[PDB]
């Protein structure tokens, strides 16, 4: 219908005029007057933003810095001033050095192949020793590389449906005092208290049956020193996101 389209266009134009009325700082029931005032305001103030503003806009969002390296030698031709707030390093340190020196000494095989037409790699550089990972991205021009650099008690133990140890986090060396290897391959029922297996068996048969809901139970675990301690567990069955099948039981053997 022509009338509906015309009405929609008129309403859109009126809304835009109302918005421009508030946008102009100087400004008033009019349309020609408001347009003239907007033009006059715009007189005081080719691309929408100058090249000096896009840099700030990109730095605020991506939170990165521009660096330049030479393929033949790897010397840092230029580093943006924003390197200091990111890596806490003065421009002097980065300048005049080699990019291979500013990375931990096992990822050199990546940069060596990358530098020697688009480039993109993930590496780690020293933080003036804490190491951080930055997603370097950029292109290659006449031969030099230009690329901005962006930025980013208890022990979990899986189980089988029967109750076998299919995983042991490294924290078990201290939380329970047993080496991870020893616990693997043995049912969790054996390590339980002499006569407490009923509670654990019921909990294991219920966690797999109650449509996968978290359960909590307390028992008396043993230790290499032959002492009884109360450690709680939080058991819930993992489910495949798509197929929706039982993968394993995740138990967090929290210690009281």
């Amino acid at each position: 219908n022509h009338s509906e389209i015309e009405r929609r266009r008129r309403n859109k134009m009126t809304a835009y005029i109302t918005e421009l009325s508030d946008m102009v700082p100087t400004c008033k029931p009019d349309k020609l007057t408001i347009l003239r005032m907007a033009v006059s305001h715009m007189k005081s103030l080719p691309s929408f933003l100058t090249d000096q503003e896009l840099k700030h806009l990109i730095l605020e969002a991506a939170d990165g810095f521009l660096f330049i390296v030479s393929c033949e030698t790897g010397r840092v031709v230029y580093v943006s001033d924003s390197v200091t707030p990111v890596l806490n390093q003065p421009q002097s340190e980065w300048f005049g050095s080699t990019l291979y020196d500013q990375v931990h000494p096992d990822d050199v095989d990546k940069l060596r192949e990358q530098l020697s037409s688009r480039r993109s790699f993930i590496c780690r550089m020293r933080c003036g020793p804490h190491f951080v990972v930055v997603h370097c991205t950029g292109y290659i021009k006449a031969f030099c590389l230009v690329a901005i650099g962006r930025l980013q008690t208890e022990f979990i133990s899986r189980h089988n449906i029967e109750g076998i140890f299919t995983f042991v986090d490294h924290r078990c060396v201290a939380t329970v005092g047993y080496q991870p290897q020893e616990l693997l391959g043995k049912n969790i029922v054996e390590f339980c208290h002499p006569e407490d297996q009923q509670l654990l068996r019921d909990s294991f048969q219920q966690v797999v049956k109650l449509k996968g809901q978290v359960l909590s139970v307390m028992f008396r675990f043993r230790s290499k020193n032959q002492e009884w301690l109360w450690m709680r567990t939080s058991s819930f069955t993992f489910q495949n996101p798509y197929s929706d099948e039982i993968e394993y039981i995740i138990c967090t053997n929290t210690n009281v």
């Binding site: 347009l35 003239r36 503003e53 700030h56």
Partner: protein
């Protein structure tokens, strides 16, 4: 009465048109494009320019500076709290064809998949960091072939950035969209420290590159049909399942850094760029993994498969 009344209307319309076409000259665009711009586009561009300049003057307030945009592999896009885009990077044409002039100022909800109008709404409105995926309309095919709007194919962007509040409260979101390259048409080189893979729908290893043996230690033929969830460290299971859900419901994802169990103990950090396949229904999922470091803590043993 009628004769004089009509005459005034003609003069008013002529004056309005003259002022409208004089305003467009002020915009920072070439006269050629400015002259033929319709009135609504002129108003939208003026509004966007004023808003962006106000934001830059309020909050965001040289020899080698122009290279910044070219080095960046995405395109900046400022979005207000109402969904309006007050500025799009000039280099958005390459990734999506839609030129800056055509798209600038339009509502963001009009150029995104309807199913993704809730994630954007949540992210725009207020810890001031954002990292989310979105589906945006495109009009450029592979290798570059502009087509009409109605033939648009949705693309997935890894949107990153931080919100920013500027006193008039008004809040403008700044994002850095990055399209994810399709593995079937890789353009950047693939360095040595990488091994391709191909998993089934429910994340089961169906085919692994031969480099895995040199990188991790598992044989290419040793991991077929085994679920991938049996290898990830138990601490990264939540992140991995979130990434898998996003892959299922959005086509492509870039999973965050996690830890994958290797052979004879230890683990190596990995980053995965998933990509679903659509049969001209889904068929299979590929992945382009990365390796960040050598095996750590080789002596320690975690899973039964390593004993």
């Amino acid at each position: 009465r009628k004769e004089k009344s009509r005459d005034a209307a003609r003069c008013r319309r002529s004056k309005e048109t003259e002022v409208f076409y004089e305003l467009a000259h002020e915009l920072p665009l070439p006269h050629s494009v400015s002259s033929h711009l319709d009135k609504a586009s002129i108003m939208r561009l003026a509004i966007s320019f004023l808003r962006t300049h106000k934001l830059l003057s309020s909050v965001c307030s040289q020899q080698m500076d122009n290279l910044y945009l070219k080095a960046l592999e995405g395109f900046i896009a400022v979005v207000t709290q109402d969904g309006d885009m007050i500025f799009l990077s000039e280099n958005i044409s390459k990734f999506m064809g839609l030129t800056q002039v055509e798209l600038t100022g339009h509502s963001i909800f009009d150029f995104t998949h309807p199913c993704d109008h809730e994630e954007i709404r949540e992210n725009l409105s207020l810890s001031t960091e954002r990292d989310f995926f979105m589906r945006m309309k495109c009009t450029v095919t592979n290798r570059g072939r502009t087509v009409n709007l109605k033939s648009a194919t949705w693309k997935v962007l890894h949107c990153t950035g931080q919100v920013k509040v500027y006193n008039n409260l008004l809040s403008c979101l700044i994002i850095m969209c990055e399209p994810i390259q399709h593995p079937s048409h890789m353009d950047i080189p693939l360095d040595s420290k990488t091994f391709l893979s191909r998993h089934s729908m429910d994340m089961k290893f169906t085919y692994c590159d031969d480099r895995i043996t040199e990188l991790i230690g598992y044989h290419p033929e040793e991991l077929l049909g085994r679920s991938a969830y049996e290898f990830y460290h138990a601490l990264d299971s939540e992140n991995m399942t979130k990434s898998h859900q996003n892959l299922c419901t959005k086509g492509q994802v870039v999973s965050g850094q996690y830890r994958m169990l290797a052979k004879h103990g230890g683990y190596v950090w990995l980053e995965t760029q998933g990509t679903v396949i659509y049969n001209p229904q889904p068929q299979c999922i590929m992945c382009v993994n990365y390796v960040l470091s050598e095996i750590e803590k080789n002596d320690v043993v975690f899973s039964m498969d390593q004993t």
